From a paper:
Alanine racemase (EC 5.1.1.1) is a pyridoxal 5′-phosphate (PLP)-dependent enzyme which catalyses racemization between l-alanine and d-alanine. d-Alanine is an essential building block of peptidoglycan, a critical component of the bacterial cell wall. Alanine racemase (Alr) is the sole source of d-alanine in many bacteria and its inhibition is lethal, making the enzyme an attractive antibiotic drug target. Kinetic studies of Alr have indicated that racemization occurs via a stepwise two-base mechanism, in which a highly conserved lysine and a tyrosine residue act as acid and base catalysts. Each Alr monomer has two distinct domains: an α/β-barrel at the N-terminus and a predominantly β-stranded domain at the C-terminus.
We have reported the crystal structure of A. baumannii alanine racemase from the highly antibiotic-resistant NCTC13302 strain to 1.9 Å resolution. The tertiary structure of A. baumannii alanine racemase (AlrAba) is a homodimer in which the two monomers interact in a head-to-tail manner. The individual AlrAba monomers are crystallographically distinct and form a dimer in the asymmetric unit. Overall, the AlrAba structure is lacking clear density for residues 247–263 and 355–356 of monomer B. Missing density for these regions has previously been observed in alanine racemases from other species, including M. tuberculosis, B. henselae, S. aureus and O. oeni. The essential PLP cofactor is covalently bound to Lys34 via an internal aldimine linkage and extends towards the centre of the α/β-barrel. The pyridine N1 of the PLP ring is stabilized by hydrogen bonding to Arg209, which is further stabilized by interactions with His159. Arg132 usually interacts with the phenolic O atom (O3′) of PLP, aiding in maintaining the position of the cofactor. The lack of substrate-like molecules in the active site could also be a contributory factor to the unusual position of Arg132 owing to this residue playing an integral role in substrate binding.
Author numbering:
A (entry chain A): 1 to 356
B (entry chain B): 1 to 246, 264 to 354
Write the structure that this text describes.
Amino acid sequence: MRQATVYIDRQALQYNLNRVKQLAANSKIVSMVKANAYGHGVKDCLAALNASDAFGVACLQEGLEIRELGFEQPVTLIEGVFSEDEMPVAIEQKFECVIHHQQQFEWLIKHKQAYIAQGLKVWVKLNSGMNRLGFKDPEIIEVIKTLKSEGFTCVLAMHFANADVDHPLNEQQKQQFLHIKETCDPILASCCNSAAIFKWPELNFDYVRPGIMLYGASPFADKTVHDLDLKPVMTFTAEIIALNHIEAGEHVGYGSTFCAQQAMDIAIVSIGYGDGYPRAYVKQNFVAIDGKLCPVVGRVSMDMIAIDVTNTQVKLGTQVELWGNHRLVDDVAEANGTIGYELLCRLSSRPVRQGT
Amino acid sequence: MRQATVYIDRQALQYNLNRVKQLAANSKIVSMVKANAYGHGVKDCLAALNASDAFGVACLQEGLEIRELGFEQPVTLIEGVFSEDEMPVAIEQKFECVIHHQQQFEWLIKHKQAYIAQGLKVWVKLNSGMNRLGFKDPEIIEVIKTLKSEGFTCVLAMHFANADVDHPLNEQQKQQFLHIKETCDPILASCCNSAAIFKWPELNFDYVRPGIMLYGASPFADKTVHDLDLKPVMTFTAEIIALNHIMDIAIVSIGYGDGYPRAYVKQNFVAIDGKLCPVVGRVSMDMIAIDVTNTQVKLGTQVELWGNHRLVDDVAEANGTIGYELLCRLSSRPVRQ
């Protein structure tokens, strides 16, 4: 059979979760497992992340998947509910809801007795500048005041727009968050994503929300996972399916975008964009084979790529790493003009998934 | 429930398959349905493409899926088999194999009695300068003349590297192909992909192999599906989940976690009720933002990410790639209607 495989290392997941604990020692952890655990597979990741205090998801359906798999941890719906009829289900399954706008506020008050009797906190989202989701200052203060007076236990929640770099909007957001915290204390609070866990332990408060770092990929353009002491969780592999010796001046692939400047050995590998390996590169990309790095040559097709193996001993069937511990997913991303998060999330169903 | 939806228009599939019949009037059609029908879902495309003479796939698993869905059309494994132990299954399921290198030729000869007795053609792939898979000239002639001698029925097969453009390697590939066919005649022949179907009817021969055109996306960077008279098959949608007055901004329930592409080289757009609206700021994992200043919307309004009104090739061009890739790299999260 064609070999295209996605391996998920459970020990690395445990290790990176433990890194969160080391960096945010006095906070509960909301492990962000949305988008099928950032493409790593919930079935394969939840057990490894079972020491989490909570799991964070993008929608009710992701939360129902967690429950169906047998997991009883608190789950936070990080965008809240999209329709009122989700409220009874959320309450029954013990899913705490983010609220970010008036509509959800009205639905929550409507279901307040059952929601409160289930012991569920409400996460009240601040828009401090991103202008995506949330209540603005000062409206958020009245919302919180009202929820408290209605009998709710609240969590003040914000997300940083640019925690991954040095940016002036980070200070505007920190100060907006502390103003609201001060104004609404006593209150639980949560604002650290992976980047903020590394940079701002003073903002840990009661709950941190790591995502990308759990998966052993970097929240920072200028730091490797080795710099951060994280372990890559996913290895994405395929195999050599053809070998070809070509002469100077011969082209390779669709588009004939690559011309051989000397004679060379080419291997064809059984992966392409139909597996979720990215097509369009803005700098040279490499794969990892036999302890070496080999350049990807010419265009990536739906089902196949070509690599220059002139300098590397290979055979038919030789295993080729597209990313993992030897070719880092964030280096592949950078060559593709994007970020690791996206590569991890846009794999197709064609590769076989294997837990390790 | 969060709304993110993939719709597949069966009538559009049928229309486009008919465009193939119009442009390649006398050939059998191998509909290319690799990669889960270029992302469209084999369950929802094989029926619509049932009039296809054959289906083409990337691997044995994809062909097994076709049979599991109840389809008995001939299937061509377009890269052949990857391990020898695939051969008894290919034979049993009546999958024709490409052979492109010596290893596969050896495994085929080893299973000749059963393969021939099953009535299965062998598609012998020529490498004429694309430099991906294939036997070279003159080595391919030997392979073919041996297979004929063993009683196999052959198809001479080739793929164009640059059929989408004007390019001299197209002529080199053509002339090599014709030379090999002449030497090995009479012989069944196949070389046209979507671009080739549009451009070179003289090279249709016995089997044409439409892929992208079936789905109503363009094989040509410089031509729209309207120019080509193809109907978009996939509509990809989500809904407005929040509205903010800053401009009026709508937040939409799609992101790169759904397969909506993140990184753009120029301004992208969505369509709402047929009207283009700009995407603003960055695409996150679960959400995008759109400028609705000129456009009357509500919470819950359905937003077209691509389909008939925002063309997938336009989105792809803004993302620095081609439609094929976008169709292929959707996540499991959106509901397939």
